Structures are given as structure tokens and as C-alpha cells.
Design a protein around this ligand. Structure first.
Ligand code: HG
Length: 256
């Protein structure tokens, strides 16, 4: 959380910085910031090696406050900026994220969602309930995750056996989809993402910087272990869980 290592890479033919972490924390700061660095919206002095949160925060503050309104939600805009600013300091420490299983862009709104929306950064997750299993669909339905854990507990202590049944139908779905990415999710997520756009991907209380390229998904390699490995930049998100290929800045294969 204190200091982060900067990694310089040849992004779109220009030396561009990227921020690394070994810690694997639940801070979306780096996910958001790396997107901004990749879009050249923040620039660092060429020599830079290490960076603090307070700099990144500063850079982010300026970035949000420098957004000119450009066509739609008017009184919302000004509240969203104020919402973004009030929650801005939380982005360093960590964040509760309550997904919904109804679609890849679906969360319970908290004001931290304003920062993504202001900056035009999509937030996605892959924890989707399958249409194929329609008992789980019925049991989960409208509910978000933290609502589903409440209802599961409520369903245990019900005397009605219908509810107690569904309380297990749902408790199954979380047990079977424990790694928070279903195959149905990965398909829907791929189709959803705009080719060559940067976005943030949520899974197991981690935020990753994501993009789509030749209609395949890749995540940025935040890992500090590959700090020296300039040729290791993107990692494929082709399978639901397992083996994955690494790529350089231009999406060509690479090895260590
Ligand atoms: Hg959020």
C-alpha cells in the first residue's frame, strides 16, 4: 500500500508507465490509474522508479476535476463529481463490491461507482448465473451478492420448506461458482467489451485492468515479479480457469 514500483513499457510506440504490486490488494486505484497512464492522461518524469498512493490520488483528483461536462444528466453530473471526490480517499485502502448475477456490468451502486463512470471506464465482472440452470436463476434472481448471503441465512431459519429448499439451491450456486467467474460470464463479458477499449475487471476482491483485442480478452500484468520483464504486458483471459498465454505491449507472444 505504501510504495509501488513503476514499470516502463513501449505502449503504442511511446514509453508509458504502468504500476506494479506484489501485494495483490483490493484497491482499484492501480486498475484505474494504469488505464489513465495507458491513455497518457497522466504523465510521469521519464526517470521515475517508485510512486506513492498520495501521488496517484493527487493525479486522479486533478484528472476527475479536469473533466468538462459534454452531453445528458446535469444535476447528476455535479453530484457525481462531489460523490467521486468525497469517496476518492477510500480508493487507496480498499473497497466492498456487491456484484449482481444478472449481467457483466451489474453491481449495487455505491458512490465509488461514480469514479469509473466519470472517467468513462467500464467496470465488469464475470460472476453470472447460467440460463441453463433455471433453478439457480429463480433462487438468485434479482438479488445482489450481499443480499443473497442475507437471504440464505434468512432461508435457513424459515420453517417454510420452499424457502429452505431455495436457501440450499442458492447456497449451492455460491459453492459451485466459488472462483467468481462462470463460463457463461466469460462469453457474455467477451461479447460485451468494446474492441481496443480499456476497462476494469472485478474478481475475488481484486481489480484488473482489462482490454479486448482481436475479439479476445486480456488483463494487464500488474504483478511485480515481472518488473524487469518489459516483454510481459498482457495475459490472456480465454479460459474460465487454467493455463494462459503472456504477450508484449503489441499483443504478440512472449516468454520469461
Ligand atoms: Hg463499484
Amino acid at each position: 500500500p505504501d510504495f509501488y514500483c513503476v514499470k516502463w513499457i513501449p505502449w503504442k510506440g511511446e514509453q508509458t508507465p504502468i504500476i506494479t504490486q506484489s501485494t495483490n490488494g483490493p484497491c482499484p486505484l492501480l486498475a484505474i490509474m494504469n488505464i489513465l497512464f495507458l491513455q497518457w492522461k497522466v504523465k510521469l518524469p521519464p526517470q521515475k522508479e517508485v510512486i506513492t498512493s498520495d501521488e496517484l490520488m493527487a493525479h486522479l483528483g486533478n484528472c476527475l476535476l479536469s473533466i468538462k461536462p459534454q452531453e445528458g444528466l446535469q444535476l447528476n453530473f455535479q453530484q457525481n463529481v462531489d460523490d467521486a471526490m468525497t469517496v476518492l480517499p477510500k480508493l487507496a485502502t480498499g473497497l466492498d463490491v456487491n456484484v449482481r448475477f444478472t449481467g457483466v456490468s451489474d453491481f449495487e451502486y455505491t458512490p465509488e461507482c461514480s469514479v469509473f463512470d466519470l472517467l468513462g471506464i467500464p467496470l465488469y465482472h464475470g460472476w453470472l448465473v447460467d440460463p441453463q440452470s433455471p433453478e439457480a436463476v429463480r433462487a438468485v434472481g434479482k438479488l445482489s451478492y450481499n443480499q443473497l448471503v442475507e437471504r440464505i441465512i434468512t432461508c435457513k431459519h424459515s420453517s417454510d420448506t420452499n424457502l429452505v429448499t431455495e436457501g440450499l439451491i442458492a447456497e449451492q450456486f455460491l459453492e459451485t461458482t466459488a472462483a467468481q467467474l462462470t463460463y457463461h460470464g466469460l462469453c457474455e463479458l467477451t461479447a460485451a467489451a468494446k474492441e481496443g477499449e480499456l476497462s476494469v475487471f472485478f474478481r475475488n476482491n481484486h481489480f484488473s485492468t482489462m482490454t479486448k483485442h482481436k475479439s479476445h480478452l486480456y488483463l494487464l500484468v500488474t504483478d511485480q515479479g515481472f518488473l524487469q520483464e518489459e516483454q510481459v504486458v498482457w495475459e490472456s483471459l480465454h479460459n474460465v480457469d487454467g493455463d494462459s498465454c503472456f504477450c508484449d505491449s503489441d499483443f504478440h507472444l512472449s516468454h520469461s
